[PDB]
Design an enzyme around this catalytic site. Structure first.
Site, mmCIF file in Angstrom:
data_model
loop_
_atom_site.group_PDB
_atom_site.id
_atom_site.type_symbol
_atom_site.label_atom_id
_atom_site.label_comp_id
_atom_site.label_asym_id
_atom_site.label_seq_id
_atom_site.Cartn_x
_atom_site.Cartn_y
_atom_site.Cartn_z
ATOM 1 N N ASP A 35 0.822 -1.208 0.000
ATOM 2 C CA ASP A 35 0.000 0.000 0.000
ATOM 3 C C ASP A 35 0.862 1.267 0.000
ATOM 4 O O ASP A 35 1.336 1.699 1.059
ATOM 5 C CB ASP A 35 -0.930 -0.026 1.217
ATOM 6 C CG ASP A 35 -1.831 1.193 1.313
ATOM 7 O OD1 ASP A 35 -1.898 1.949 0.331
ATOM 8 O OD2 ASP A 35 -2.482 1.389 2.383
ATOM 9 N N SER A 199 -0.340 15.606 -12.067
ATOM 10 C CA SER A 199 -0.581 15.244 -13.448
ATOM 11 C C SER A 199 -0.814 16.499 -14.278
ATOM 12 O O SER A 199 -1.360 17.478 -13.790
ATOM 13 C CB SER A 199 -1.773 14.293 -13.537
ATOM 14 O OG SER A 199 -2.153 14.075 -14.879
#
Length: 330
Positions: A35, A199
Site C-alpha cells: 500500500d 498530473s
C-alpha cells in the site's frame, strides 16, 4: 541488494493485490496488501480477537525466534474507506522476494474492522508511503522500504500491476524489460506523507488532451481512480446510459456500453488506461448496472491515482534524497 515478488489480484475484478511476505524465524508467509498510500506493516496475528479472524493466515510471534516485543508500543490506523485496525508491535525479520530486513516493526493486530475480517485473502498491509505517516506510538517506526533503502543497489521500488493478471513489485532496481519507451519522472511532494505529484491533464477516449494540473497520490492500496468531479463528469458523459447514483455510491453504467479509454498526463508523456480497466462489473449479482472505475474525489479531499491508473503503467517510486515518481507505458 534487490528483491522481486509477484503480486496477484485477490479476485476477478482486481479489487486489490496480494504479495507474499516472509515474517520471522522460521518464516511465516503472509499475503499482504502492498500500500503506497500508508506506512504501517500490520498483520492478522495470534493476538487478533478470534471473532474477527475468518480465513486469514496469522502471524504468531511466539513461534518466531527472532521476534521481540517493542515494549510499550501501540498502533491504531483508520483508512480512507472507513476500515481500521489496531494492536501492539514486534520487531522481526521480514523478507520480500529475496530482500531481507532485520528489526522491521511488525504491527500485530488485536482488533480489525469488519471489512478486513470479511476479506479472507488479505492477511495484512505493508505500507510504502513515507514513514512520517506511521502510526506507532510513542516511537514512530520505519517502513520496510525505508529500512531496506541503504542496502538496496538503488533506493527505489517499482510497481508493475497486472490487469486481470499477476504483476511484480521490485526493490532496488529498474527492470528495463518491463516497460516500453522511456520512463518520465515527475516531482513529488512528501508534505502529506504520500507519493503526491501533479498530473498535467487528461483526455477521454480519442478526445483532445486537456492541459490542467491535477494534484494527487500514487496509491497502490486504493482500487479505483478518484479525480475531480469535473473530470469524472466529462468521462462518464461519453458513456451512453451512465449516471451517478447516490444509492450505489457513484457512477454506474449499462454493462452493454463500451467504455472509452482515459489518458492522464505525466509531464509531456501520456499514460492510456484502456476502457476495459474501468469496468468493475455488476453492482450486485445479476444486475445489468456496472460499477465505474473512475469516480469523484469530491469530499475525499485528495485525488487518488489508484490501481485503475497505476496498472496501466510501469511505476517507479524513487526514494532518492529528493523523491520522484516515474511512469512508463508497458
Amino acid at each position: 541488494s534487490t528483491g522481486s515478488a509477484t503480486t496477484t489480484p485477490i479476485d476477478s475484478l482486481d479489487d486489490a493485490y496480494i504479495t507474499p511476505v516472509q515474517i520471522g524465524t522460521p518464516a511465516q508467509t503472509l499475503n499482504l496488501d502492498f500500500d503506497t498510500g500508508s506506512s504501517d506493516l500490520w498483520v492478522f496475528s495470534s493476538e487478533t480477537t478470534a471473532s474477527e479472524v475468518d480465513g486469514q493466515t496469522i502471524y504468531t510471534p511466539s513461534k518466531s525466534t527472532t521476534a521481540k516485543l517493542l515494549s510499550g508500543a501501540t498502533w491504531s490506523i483508520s483508512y480512507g474507506d472507513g476500515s481500521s485496525s489496531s494492536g501492539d508491535v514486534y520487531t522481526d525479520t521480514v523478507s520480500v522476494g529475496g530482500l531481507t530486513v532485520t528489526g522491521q516493526a511488525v504491527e500485530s493486530a488485536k482488533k480489525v474492522s469488519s471489512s478486513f475480517t470479511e476479506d479472507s485473502t488479505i492477511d495484512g498491509l505493508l505500507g510504502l508511503a513515507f514513514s512520517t505517516l506511521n502510526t506507532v506510538s510513542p516511537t514512530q517506526q520505519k517502513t520496510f522500504f525505508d529500512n531496506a533503502k541503504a542496502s538496496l543497489d538503488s533506493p527505489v521500488f517499482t510497481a508493475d500491476l497486472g490487469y486481470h493478471a499477476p504483476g511484480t513489485y521490485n526493490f532496488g532496481f529498474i527492470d528495463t524489460t518491463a516497460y516500453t519507451g522511456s520512463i518520465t519522472y515527475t516531482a513529488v511532494s512528501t508534505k502529506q506523507g504520500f507519493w503526491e505529484w501533479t498530473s498535467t491533464g487528461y483526455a477521454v477516449g480519442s478526445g483532445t488532451f486537456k492541459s490542467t494540473s491535477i494534484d494527487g497520490i500514487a496509491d497502490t492500496g486504493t482500487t479505483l481512480l478518484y479525480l475531480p468531479a469535473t473530470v469524472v463528469s466529462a468521462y462518464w458523459a461519453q458513456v451512453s446510459g451512465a449516471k451517478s447514483s447516490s444509492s450505489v455510491g457513484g457512477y454506474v453504467f449499462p454493462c452493454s456500453a463500451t467504455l472509452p479509454s482515459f489518458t492522464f498526463g505525466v509531464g509531456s508523456a501520456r499514460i492510456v488506461i484502456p476502457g476495459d480497466y474501468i469496468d468493475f462489473g455488476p453492482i450486485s449479482t445479476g444486475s445489468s448496472s456496472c460499477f465505474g472505475g473512475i469516480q469523484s474525489s469530491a469530499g475525499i479531499g485528495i485525488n487518488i491515482f489508484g490501481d485503475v491508473a497505476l496498472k496501466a503503467a510501469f511505476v517507479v517510486f524513487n526514494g532518492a534524497t529528493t523523491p520522484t515518481l516515474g511512469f512508463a507505458s508497458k
